[PDB]
Design a protein around this ligand. Sequence first.
Ligand SMILES: O=CN(O)CCP(=O)(O)O
Ligand SMILES: O=CN(O)CCP(=O)(O)O
Lengths: 249, 249
Amino acid sequence: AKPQPIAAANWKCNGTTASIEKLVQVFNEHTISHDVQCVVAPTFVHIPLVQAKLRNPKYVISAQNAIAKSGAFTGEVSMPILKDIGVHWVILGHSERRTYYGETDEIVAQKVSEACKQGFMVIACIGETLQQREANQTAKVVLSQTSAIAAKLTKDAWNQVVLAYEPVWAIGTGKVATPEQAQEVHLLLRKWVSENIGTDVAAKLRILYGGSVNAANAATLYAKPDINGFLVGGASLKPEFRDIIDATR
Amino acid sequence: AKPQPIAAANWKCNGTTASIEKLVQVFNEHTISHDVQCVVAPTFVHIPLVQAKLRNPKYVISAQNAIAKSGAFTGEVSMPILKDIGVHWVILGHSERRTYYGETDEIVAQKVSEACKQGFMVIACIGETLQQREANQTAKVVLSQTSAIAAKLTKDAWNQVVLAYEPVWAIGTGKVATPEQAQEVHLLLRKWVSENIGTDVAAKLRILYGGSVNAANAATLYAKPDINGFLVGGASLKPEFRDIIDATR
Ligand SMILES: O=CN(O)CCP(=O)(O)O
Ligand SMILES: O=CN(O)CCP(=O)(O)O
């Protein structure tokens, strides 16, 4: 049987108080009748607003990034500060942070390790570029990113980890991966975890697909055996996020 | 006569809801009887809390960093999002961002330019390292950082700019610059602005000193003619921030 699916909304750097209040009411009035964990990740300045308005019991709030420790780091938000305000989910290693803001595999693996030590649920992102994919390096890249994270974790910490595979060429481009492309990578990741970490760990691990997911292609992706849900960018800012959630039934 | 002084608290990546509620009450009960603009910059997740509790009329709230535009920038907060929640001050180019998070002179100058276009008051940070200072390059470095910002601005935008000189060797080390060291750099900056931008601009520009300021050395720094106030890190997390404010009388 599949583990519990996740439908995660990453709002990236978007939103106004007016537009967030309306969308959150749309999420609140949508009744979800199956077992799914819904996740909303707003910008840091909107966490308090979302905490005050979001009432749907299937949802939790996540930060879009964090650093491990408080201190002299002007502009950043740390894990202890998020925990103190009630946030215990975080997205780490998003492609945009790896590309624009210098997060290497080592930096992402250290952040994931620290988040696990501080009790967070982590959504760790991995994925290849179009250049790597055309050079037939997809497997090597995704397994190198994953084993760099695995090297800093203990077996028990895998209980707090969610992997999100998002090919860089599918992010915000409208070119979603086919169900078959996504399933082959998810299967390869699950097998690697099964062999290197444990078969019990592999059976429970959620591996999500992200990159141009919308309400019409979600159900076809979710039909594949090793896809456990989605990380959604642009479609999570709209009311069709409701039908993405309902595609994990 | 000096322009209106500024006393700015940069809380960096520190704070809990409990410790911020107590400190803000301390700031609220301190009556300020002279003309000074007080500034508090908390982490992004604490902006809403500080907005709800801070009542002292001499204070404004500032963000510790921002990006210019909303969009697919996971983890970042943009200028339009800050404006929408009521924040219209921002600190840019802090040494910690230049050192750890890759902000070059060009990146800082583009952020400052955009902030000015969007109507923010900006605290732009500049300063030399211990290596540059020992190599007698202080003047060259601080003027190169400043002219890189000046190149993207119009004369009228200088009305929204505050410069903060913080030698990198004085930040959080306990080794404050002497009044004479700070005054020589502030005078050099003011003259450069007077010659390259305008004498009217130079007369009104606030140039703050930062780096190990505390309540005992503040009054001696403020006695120098070209020092217009302070950017304070560690001492701004304590009740002695009150006497730093009162040293600008
Ligand atoms: O964080 C999630 N993603 O980046 C998916 C982005 P999108 O759904 O717009 O292609
Ligand atoms: O942002 C302000 N500064 O970095 C000054 C830091 P401090 O006052 O701890 O030396």
